[PDB]
Amino acid sequence: LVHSSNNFGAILSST
Amino acid sequence: LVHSSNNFGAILSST
Amino acid sequence: LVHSSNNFGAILSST
Amino acid sequence: LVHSSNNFGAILSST
Amino acid sequence: LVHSSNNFGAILSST
Amino acid sequence: LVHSSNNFGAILSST
Amino acid sequence: QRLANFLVHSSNNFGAILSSTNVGSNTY
Amino acid sequence: QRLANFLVHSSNNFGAILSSTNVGSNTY
Amino acid sequence: QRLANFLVHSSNNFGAILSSTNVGSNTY
Amino acid sequence: QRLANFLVHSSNNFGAILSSTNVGSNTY
Amino acid sequence: QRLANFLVHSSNNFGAILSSTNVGSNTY
Amino acid sequence: QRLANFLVHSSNNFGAILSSTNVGSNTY
Amino acid sequence: NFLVHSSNNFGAILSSTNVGSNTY
Amino acid sequence: NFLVHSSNNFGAILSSTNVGSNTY
Amino acid sequence: NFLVHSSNNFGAILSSTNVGSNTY
Amino acid sequence: NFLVHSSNNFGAILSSTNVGSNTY
Amino acid sequence: NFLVHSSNNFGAILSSTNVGSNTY
Amino acid sequence: NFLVHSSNNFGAILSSTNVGSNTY
């Protein structure tokens, strides 16, 4: 589960 | 489950 | 579970 | 579980 | 479990 | 468990 | 969530880019 | 969450970029 | 969370970048 | 959390970068 | 947590960087 | 935690860096 | 095989070159 | 085979070149 | 095989080059 | 095989080069 | 095989080079 | 095999080079 709030940057998730 | 609120950036998810 | 609030930087998560 | 608040830097997590 | 508050630097965690 | 508050430096943790 | 009076400029690139530039080769 | 009067400039790149530049080779 | 009157400039790069620059080779 | 009147300049790089620069080789 | 009137300049690099620079080789 | 009126300049490097510089080889 | 290249310049030359200012 | 190339310039030349300003 | 290259310059030359200012 | 290269300069030359100012 | 290279300079030359100012 | 290289300079030359100022 990935939760993001007010993301102005770059988010990278690898599973 | 991916939840995004107010995303101004770049979000990358790989599963 | 990944939770991010007000992320202005770069977040990288590898599992 | 990864929790980030007000992240202006670069966060790298490898598991 | 990793908790970060007001991170302006670079945080690296390897497990 | 790693807890960081007001981190302006570089923190490296290896386990 | 309340947000107001904010200007956002976002640019995202996911594609390979190849650029070649030549300026010159003039005889005077 | 309340946010106001903020300007954001975000640039993100995930793609390989190759750039070649040549300036010169002029005869005077 | 209350945030106001803040300017943010964020640049993130995850891609390999190759740059070649040549300036010169002029005959006077 | 209350934050105000702050300017942030953040640059993050995770990609290999190769740069070549040549200046010169002029005949006068 | 209360924070105000602060300027932050953060630069982070995690990638290998190779730089080559040549200046000269001019005949006068 | 209360913090105010502070300027922070942080630089962090985790990547190998190779730099080559040549200046000279001019004939006068 | 006789080849001659002659270039003569007597005029002031001003050159300005800008390459860049790209956002990715 | 006789080839002659002659270029003569006596006029002031001003050149401005801009390449870039692209957003991706 | 006779080849002659001659370049003569008598004019003031001003050159400005900028390469960079790219944000990634 | 006779080759001659001659370059003559009599004009003041001003060159400015900037390479960099890139943010990653 | 006869080769001659001649370069003559009589003009003041000013060169400024900047390489760097990159943020990573 | 006869090769001649001649370079003659009579003009004042000023060269400034800066390489660095990079933040990592």
Numbering used by the authors:
A (entry chain O), B (entry chain R), C (entry chain L), D (entry chain I), E (entry chain F), F (entry chain C): 16 to 30
G (entry chain P), H (entry chain M), I (entry chain J), J (entry chain G), K (entry chain D), L (entry chain A): 10 to 37
M (entry chain N), N (entry chain Q), O (entry chain K), P (entry chain H), Q (entry chain E), R (entry chain B): 14 to 37
Which sentences from the paper describe this structure?
Islet amyloid polypeptide (IAPP, or amylin) is a 37-residue peptide hormone that is cosecreted with insulin and one of the most amyloid-prone sequences known. Overproduction and aggregation of IAPP leads to amyloid deposition in the islets of Langerhans, a pathological hallmark of type-2 diabetes. Although the precise link between IAPP aggregation and disease remains uncertain, IAPP aggregates have been shown to be toxic in cell-based assays, and genetic and animal studies implicate islet amyloid in the progressive loss of pancreatic β-cell function. Over 40 different proteins, with diverse native structures or in many cases intrinsic disorder, form amyloid associated with human disease, yet all amyloid fibrils share a common cross-β architecture consisting of a continuous intermolecular β-sheet supported by networks of zipper and ladder-like interactions. Amyloid fibrils have a similar cross-β architecture, but fibrils formed by a single protein sequence can have diverse structures, varying with time, self-assembly conditions, and sequence modifications.
Virtual screening, ThT assays, and biophysical characterization successfully identified two widely used FDA-approved drugs, canagliflozin and doxazosin, as inhibitors of IAPP amyloid formation. Cryo-EM was performed on fibrils assembled from 30 μM IAPP in the same buffer used for kinetic assays (160 mM ammonium acetate, pH 7.4, 1% v/v DMSO), in the absence (4 replicates) or presence (2 replicates each) of 50 μM YX-I-1, canagliflozin, or doxazosin. Fibrils with a similar morphology were observed for the control (no small molecule) and doxazosin-containing samples, with the majority having a twisted ribbon morphology and crossover distances of 60–100 nm. The majority of fibrils formed in the control (69%) and doxazosin-treated (72%) samples were classified into three related fibril structures (named LL, LLU, and LLUU, respectively), which have a shared structural core consisting of a pair of protofilaments related by a 21-screw symmetry. Each protofilament is formed from a single stack of L-shaped IAPP subunits, with straight β-strand segments encompassing 13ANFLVHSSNNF23 and 25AILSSTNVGSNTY37-NH2, hinging on a turn at Gly24. In addition, further flanking subunits presenting U-shaped IAPP subunit conformations and ambiguous β-strands were observed adhering to these two β-sheets, with the combinations of these flanking subunits differing to generate the three individual polymorphs LL, LLU, and LLUU. By contrast, the control and doxazosin-treated samples consisted of L-fold (62% or 72%, respectively), U-fold (34% or 28%), and S-fold (4% or 0%) subunits.
